[PDB]
Design a protein around this ligand. Structure first.
Ligand SMILES: Nc1ncnc2c1ncn2[C@@H]1O[C@H](COP(=O)(O)OP(=O)(O)OP(=O)(O)O)[C@@H](O)[C@H]1O
Ligand SMILES: [Mg+2]
Lengths: 50, 100, 50, 50
């Protein structure tokens, strides 16, 4: 199923970040907002801004 | 080369218009092999172009320097601010302080 | 640049309409009134236009 | 019981407050803001501000 429009976003952004030597400071922020993006409704304005 | 790892600096060319201050920037960028980018500062008043936005606004996008980071994959591009001499400063509150 | 086809009425941006209405891939697009562009919520779109 | 809940968000603040000794004055304002925070539906912009 290619209908997934939530965890697909999670895996895409999580994969894009691997190569960089991320500072832990930003790593915490990106992880938190990933956790917040992964629970939200797909079509709310909050999901698009996130 | 003598002091180990790569490092930044600042410089300021100055001279009569049309003498080639700009072309040497692109040539130096090709010589040192780091990526190039440039943007005017002349006449601007608000700081948002150098400073993005608070992102609770409906239309915000990160300031242009962050776009240049998004394109210039390098974390040490040769930014070239240009024509600071006629920096816009007529608005109340200098953007130039943010530049400093 | 157009919308993300999530928002209401997310029609493609103007260049796509010109590509459709002209029904050929090599129109002579003609920008007009360039002088007073800029100072939007985004600062200006001029970068993308460039 | 298992799985995530809003009270976990309520909790991570509380624990952050548990160590440092706050003045009694601000000990209340945080209390009423917390008690308000649970009752909101999470997608309302009011939840973002609070
Ligand atoms: N030393 C030089 N050798 C070859 N070309 C030159 C030289 N100096 C200037 N030019 C020519 O001038 C053109 C623009 O030069 P440049 O933009 O550096 O002028 P400028 O002094 O930067 O003007 P301004 O500073 O007002 O923007 C280029 O196309 C370049 O080929
Ligand atoms: Mg020049």
């Amino acid at each position: 199923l290619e209908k997934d429009d939530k965890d697909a976003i999670e895996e895409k952004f999580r994969e894009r970040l691997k190569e960089l030597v991320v500072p832990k400071h930003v790593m915490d922020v990106v992880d938190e907002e990933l956790s917040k993006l992964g629970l939200l409704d797909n079509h709310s304005s909050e999901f698009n801004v996130t | 080369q003598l002091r180990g790892s790569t490092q930044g600096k600042i410089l300021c060319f100055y001279g009569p218009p049309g003498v080639g201050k700009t072309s040497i920037a692109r040539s130096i960028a090709r010589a040192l092999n780091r990526e190039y980018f440039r943007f005017s500062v002349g006449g601007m008043t608000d700081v948002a172009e150098i400073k993005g936005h608070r992102r609770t606004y409906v239309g915000a996008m990160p300031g242009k320097i962050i776009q240049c980071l998004k394109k210039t994959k390098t974390e040490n591009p040769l930014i070239l601010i240009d024509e600071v001499d006629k920096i816009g400063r007529g608005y109340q509150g200098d953007p130039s302080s943010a530049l400093l």
